[PDB]
Design a protein around this ligand. Sequence first.
Ligand SMILES: CCCCCCCC/C=C/CCCCCCCC(=O)O[C@@H](COC(=O)CCCCCCCCCCCCCCC)COP(=O)([O-])OCC[N+](C)(C)C
Ligand SMILES: CCCCCCCC/C=C\CCCCCCCC(=O)O[C@@H](COC(=O)CCCCCCCCCCCCCCC)COP(=O)([O-])OCC[N+](C)(C)C
Ligand SMILES: O=S1(=O)NCN(C2CC2)c2ccc(F)cc21
Ligand SMILES: O=S1(=O)NCN(C2CC2)c2ccc(F)cc21
Ligand SMILES: C=C(C)[C@H]1CN[C@H](C(=O)O)[C@H]1CC(=O)O
Ligand SMILES: *[C@@H]1O[C@H](CO)[C@@H](O)[C@H](O)[C@H]1NC(C)=O
Lengths: 50, 101, 51, 51
Amino acid sequence: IDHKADLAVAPLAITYVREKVIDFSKPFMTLGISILYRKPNGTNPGVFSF
Amino acid sequence: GNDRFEGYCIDLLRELSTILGFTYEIRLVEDGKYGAQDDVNGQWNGMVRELIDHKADLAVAPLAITYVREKVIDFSKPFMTLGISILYRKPNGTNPGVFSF
Amino acid sequence: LIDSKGYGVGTPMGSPYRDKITIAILQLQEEGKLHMMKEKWWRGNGCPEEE
Amino acid sequence: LIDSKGYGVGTPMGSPYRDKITIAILQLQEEGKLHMMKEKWWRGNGCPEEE
Ligand SMILES: CCCCCCCC/C=C/CCCCCCCC(=O)O[C@@H](COC(=O)CCCCCCCCCCCCCCC)COP(=O)([O-])OCC[N+](C)(C)C
Ligand SMILES: CCCCCCCC/C=C\CCCCCCCC(=O)O[C@@H](COC(=O)CCCCCCCCCCCCCCC)COP(=O)([O-])OCC[N+](C)(C)C
Ligand SMILES: O=S1(=O)NCN(C2CC2)c2ccc(F)cc21
Ligand SMILES: O=S1(=O)NCN(C2CC2)c2ccc(F)cc21
Ligand SMILES: C=C(C)[C@H]1CN[C@H](C(=O)O)[C@H]1CC(=O)O
Ligand SMILES: *[C@@H]1O[C@H](CO)[C@@H](O)[C@H](O)[C@H]1NC(C)=O
């Protein structure tokens, strides 16, 4: 905003409130919010499955 | 009027209307087409063309963001996300019979 | 997907509505409106299984 | 994905480097350089232990 730089080449995600103060280029990468979680370890009980 | 039409990009144009207020009128493109340079002339065709000589103001339609379309007209930031992909037939139902053993 | 592209309400070269529409697309995307409309039209009728 | 939104080279409000990178980002994409650079970094040891 205060012109201390010229570009912002970074992972700077396009948000509604960021577009109203600075102006972005058109996206060089697509994403969305998504949940990260530990891959579950161990297996099902399965005393059957004969 | 504006009641002949329905779709995603008519629902989008109504939702952009209640935010801004620019009350619109649909004049669909006549020589139905999107945009291409004819490679000998260099002239555009269809909805890229009718925005060049200011005949209409918007292009609310599946007008993809192409490198050659951006130099000429001004696209907004996207509202969907495309990709080129292949439409082929699903294979036959193999149908294992009751006497398959 | 072979490439990635996207749509856009196309405006003439140097039109003022390049900015006033992308404010109202980014607003309709965080309010979930651009996913309620995609779901309302691309709902289809369903395909049975991918077994 | 919960929403869908994207990255972008941020420019000050009024800077002409907005439109000169707008065409430039589209230039690397149809040539396949944006896919080539992303392939080079987001691919690593694939965790192939599924089999
Ligand atoms: C073909 C050659 C042999 C034929 C011989 C005779 C055949 C006659 C019939 C034999 C079997 C009788 C019907 C079985 C129905 C079970 C259905 C099922 O799939 O499981 C369901 C319910 O399963 C249960 O959890 C409880 C089922 C009954 C428990 C005792 C087994 C009966 C064996 C009788 C002893 C023989 C006595 C009679 C003869 C002396 C689903 O649950 P699950 O899947 O189990 O969940 C665990 C697995 N998992 C965690 C990974 C999900
Ligand atoms: C009862 C005696 C009678 C005399 C006969 C003697 C003959 C000899 C017969 C057998 C000799 C050997 C038997 C030992 C087998 C069990 C092995 C074990 O301990 O570990 C297992 C115990 O899981 C079980 O299998 C429980 C067995 C209990 C038996 C009684 C249940 C039914 C009772 C009657 C029912 C109602 C009756 C109504 C009738 C209609 C657990 O293993 P784990 O390491 O923890 O792995 C967990 C797996 N997981 C992590 C994936 C989850
Ligand atoms: O045509 S764009 O503005 N720029 C190119 N890209 C990303 C590089 C994949 C994308 C990705 C998704 C879009 F909706 C638009 C575009
Ligand atoms: O934040 S954006 O510029 N506009 C909103 N969208 C589409 C509505 C998903 C997208 C989709 C993919 C992008 F890379 C960017 C955007
Ligand atoms: C690492 C940080 C703080 C960055 C990464 N990109 C997000 C952004 O572009 O705002 C930020 C937050 C996140 O990871 O959710
Ligand atoms: C099976 O495949 C043939 C050609 O591959 C096609 O003509 C036929 O309609 C298919 N039958 C189905 C999909 O039931």
